[PDB]
DNA sequence: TCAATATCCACCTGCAGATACTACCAAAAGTGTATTTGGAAACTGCTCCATCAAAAGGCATGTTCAGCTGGATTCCAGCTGAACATGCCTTTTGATGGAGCAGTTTCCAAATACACTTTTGGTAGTATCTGCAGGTGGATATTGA
DNA sequence: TCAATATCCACCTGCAGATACTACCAAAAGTGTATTTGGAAACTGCTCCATCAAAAGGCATGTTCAGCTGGAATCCAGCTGAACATGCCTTTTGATGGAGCAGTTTCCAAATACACTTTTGGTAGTATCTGCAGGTGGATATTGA
């Protein structure tokens, strides 16, 4: 594959500690169970990710597995970033949103990444690496939003790259079916927590 | 806009009268930029070598230093 | 006059090229050798890096000058830069 | 009851000793080594500052800059010779102009 | 944490040009400048002790390194304050 | 008492060119080109350890060094091989 | 009973070179692998440079290798003459090169 | 011609050009200035050392010096080239 | 003398075997300056690497290392 | 263009120095095994300092001109190379002693460890004070005449 | 040479950003006292190789001449610098992260010591064989014709 996309992965899994590290690979599916049984996870972690780069080599991954790995090790590492919350108002199934983010963000902006995974309660995560008009995204520092089909309440987090956040919420705005987003007077580290009190507030008016 | 189009004539033409030269010809102001190029490349891949070494993201200036003194040139003001 | 800017310039200490366009340059170098990864820079580095590439070039500058007379000249050319670089090594 | 007092320096003698013997430079070192080697740094960072306060005082200035070390340094046949491989931050170049 | 030579700079200034002072950047020079002397005598100690099968660095060592580093007359009279220097330390 | 690398030139000759001999001038260059490397790559890894704190020399630091003194295709091929050795010695 | 050479697969000594870097005063411990990286690294630039030398020696109808087939090669070559530009070769002469 | 012989011939060999006991007796004549005036005795090896890298430093500067010659339009070996690559240089 | 044992044809070989085709007839003095620096420099250094062993024999190994401090490294003797 | 003379190039012969091979050996160096120990990896976490945007004004960009310089040509006298005849200095070879190198003693100097005192680095909060920027007045060289 | 205009120096005032000076502290580190150990100096002896002589001839030296080249003087056209009007990119500022750096734990890999093989360096002695020099012998360009 790719050298951009190997470093990518490596980096990626070595920041998974080894505690946890066959449960995500699990999740990812990208190797097979057997590819997994020959690996030895008792040695340092620099010999474990060279045999699992390997692996990959021997198949051929995109991007979008990678991007795949790095959403589902966000899932579990949720504190690692601030959540901020946005509200839609003045108002489609999941694969007619899923296209219509995809082709307005296509169309802003010719280069970029973006990928979903589902979750249960109908949520729906997406990872976004944004581009220009002439160069190539940046996957280190992507935008992660959590957005929940059921519901017009939607979950940012803060990236260390602005110039993107209203091209965001105008996506959000038109692939659903609604016309208008504000942000809610609520942000901080613990997801769940906004998650909380987000639904009680929609349960209970 | 190529990134060493901003090395621009004026500067050069500074660096050359700061040399001692009086005047100058239209194609020195390529042949800089190569040469610049060329120092830069050298300096830059020994000076991220020791820093991948460190598992560090971020270029101190003690790589560049230890970078420089090997290529051959050491420089004091910086630590 | 050629002969103000010159005594001017070699009276002062400050760096001649402007730092955007050189951070900028120098990152783009980096991220050959990183695989595609922004590797940040302290602000002291790009410094150090600017002064010694400022110094190249203006002990180059010299040696090279001192190849124009040698052939009769006045004008600086590309033909005596390289031959400076030959001989230095 | 200081090394560097006993010797009549100002330089420091015991951190000169554990620098040596930090460094892997030689499984021992003796009691001589760290002063010889200080008193000889001591004299060679004096006779700079000399020619740095010199210069100063000929631009009709009170405090020592970059400046000042360049041309000391440049100015001097021997000293050039020890430092010519070294470019010094803020220092410039010698003024030189020559007739063709 | 941090460990630098200035102290002693600065009293070797004192001593030698009492009306004058030092600016910060130009310290750093200095700082700099102590550091490579130091790695260039004690690498060439290292070697000289290498070479002639020897355990241990002493007076000697340093006197020569000294003398194949420097140039000419400051090699003289580096070698001439260190030896004044050993010899009035061994007699306290 | 005195100890070369000739043995081993040897065996490597008749290993790439089994028809070809070597003369004992050129053996004297090629031990000296042993010796060379060897010191260079050895002092590089010295240096890596003391900056980052480290007093422990490993495979790591003598990659690093081959990366920084060898110039491009060289120190891939370099490293390749003794990456290779490295793993089929462990693996014994 | 069995070496470390051929637990590796080489020429090259291991136990030597481990012995050189523990006399040399280049660090308070050494590990298992160093050596045998550096060992690796030293027998591939001698056959590097053998086989140029070699092929030098054959071009001029010869069966043994001297000091100027060794120069030949070196400076034939845009990388080994890099590595070895602040180095001369005895009796190895100079390339032709008029003009 | 015979310039263009002698260089052929010159830059196909490898021996040393320079006589043996005239450079012996110079290097001797030079030691004796330091050693605090006593003679030391010399190895052969060194001494031949000692003409192989001098004979060397000599070619390379020839070689660097006549590229100076050919950039001033001239084809005839002058001092000022010899000097100024030995400036350029940095010795 | 002692100088002008290095002779005329022999600096004249030097030169050809370096490319040259004519040569001034000022060459031959400012080659026997060149040299006689050269070899200052190395012996002296020899000599100090010599005597801080205490023998009276100038080795091969001196000159060696003496090269390679001024960074002349050489290869075929030691 | 012709071609003898160098000159080149190839090819064969002989032999002398230097290579490669075999045997012995012995020592010193590397391997295996078991124990203990300490360095470094793995995981947390917090504060610093790096990155990303924005607003504007100062330096760079573009066009024209004319004066200066680079480059080619001609001519002439100085200086280099080539050839030839001498002879002086280098090269090669061999008896000789001075200095390097190994082995044995011992003794002086360095490492190891514990207690105790001193010094240096960093922060808080000052207080100067040196140097730079702007303003104004006096004095000369060079531009063109 | 006259001369106005920049330009050159010099002096002055103002101020603010940076250097010296105190306090203080407390953590790290250096010093002093005993004790043990081993590295290097001092002495003797031996044999290797480096200095010092004396013949032989091959390369260096000196003179002269012919021709090649360096250097100076013309001349012409290309091209670089200077000046002016304009606008776009860099500099400065403020706001957040995210990555470096310090802390704790533990476990795995390194040092240490002892007993046992093995491999490499050196020495006779063997022989053999590669390449250098010589000479034959075929065949090409070359500067004088």
Redesign the interface.
């Not at chain 1, 940046?138 to 520092?141: A, D, F, L, P, T």
């Given at each position: 594959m790719d050298?951009?996309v190997?470093?990518?992965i490596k980096?990626t899994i070595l920041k998974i500690p080894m505690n946890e590290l066959t449960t995500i690979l699990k999740a990812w599916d990208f190797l097979s169970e057997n590819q997994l049984q020959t690996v030895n996870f008792r040695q340092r972690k620099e010999s474990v990710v060279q045999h699992l780069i390997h692996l990959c080599e021997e198949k051929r991954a995109s991007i979008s597995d990678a991007a795949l790995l790095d959403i589902i090790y966000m899932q579990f590492h949720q504190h690692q970033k601030v959540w901020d919350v946005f509200q839609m108002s003045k108002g489609f199934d999941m694969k007619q949103f899923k296209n219509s983010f995809k082709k307005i963000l296509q169309r802003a902006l010719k280069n970029v990444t973006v990928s979903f995974r589902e979750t249960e309660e109908n949520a729906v995560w997406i990872r976004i690496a944004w581009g220009t008009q002439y160069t190539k995204p940046?996957?280190?520092?992507p935008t992660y939003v959590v957005y929940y089909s059921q519901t017009p309440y939607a979950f940012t987090s803060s990236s260390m790259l602005r110039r993107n956040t209203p091209l965001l919420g105008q996506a959000l705005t038109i692939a659903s079916k609604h016309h208008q987003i504000v942000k809610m007077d609520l942000r901080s580290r613990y997801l769940d927590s906004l998650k909380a009190i987000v639904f009680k507030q929609y349960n209970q008016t | 806009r190529d990134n060493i189009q901003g090395i621009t004539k004026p500067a050069i033409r500074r660096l050359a009268r700061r040399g001692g030269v009086k005047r100058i010809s239209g194609l020195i102001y390529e042949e800089t930029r190569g040469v610049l190029k060329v120092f830069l490349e050298n300096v830059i891949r020994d000076a991220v070598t020791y820093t991948e070494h460190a598992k560090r993201k971020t270029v101190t200036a003690m790589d560049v230093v230890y970078a420089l003194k090997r290529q051959g040139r050491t420089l004091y003001g910086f630590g | 006059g050629w002969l103000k800017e010159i005594r001017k310039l070699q009276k002062s200490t400050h760096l001649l090229i402007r730092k955007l366009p050189f951070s900028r340059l120098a990152r783009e170098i980096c991220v050959k050798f990183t695989?595609?990864?922004?590797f940040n820079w302290q602000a002291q580095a790009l410094l150090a890096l600017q002064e010694a590439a400022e110094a190249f070039l203006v002990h180059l500058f010299e040696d090279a000058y001192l190849l124009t007379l040698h052939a009769g000249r006045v004008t600086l050319f590309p033909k005596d830069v390289q031959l400076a670089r030959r001989i230095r090594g | 009851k200081s090394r560097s007092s006993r010797a009549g320096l100002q330089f420091p003698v015991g951190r000169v000793h554990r620098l040596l013997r930090k460094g892997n430079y030689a499984e021992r070192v003796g009691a001589g080594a760290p002063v010889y080697l200080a008193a000889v740094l001591e004299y060679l960072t004096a006779e700079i500052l000399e020619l740095a306060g010199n210069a100063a005082r000929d631009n009709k200035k009170t405090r020592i800059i970059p400046r000042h070390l360049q041309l000391a340094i440049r100015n001097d046949e021997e000293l050039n010779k020890l430092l010519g491989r070294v470019t010094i931050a803020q220092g410039g170049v010698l003024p030189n102009i020559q007739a063709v | 944490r941090k460990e630098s030579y200035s102290v002693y700079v600065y009293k070797v200034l004192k001593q030698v040009h009492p009306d004058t002072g030092i600016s910060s950047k130009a310290m750093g020079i200095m700082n700099s400048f102590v550091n490579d002397i130091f790695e260039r005598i004690a690498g060439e100690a290292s070697r000289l002790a290498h070479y002639n099968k020897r355990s241990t660095i002493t007076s000697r060592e340093i006197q020569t390194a000294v003398r194949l580093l420097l140039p000419g007359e400051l090699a003289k009279h580096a070698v001439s304050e260190g030896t004044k220097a050993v010899t009035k330390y061994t007699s306290s």
């Open positions: 050298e951009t190997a470093e990518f980096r940046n996957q280190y520092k | - | 695989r595609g990864v922004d | - | -």
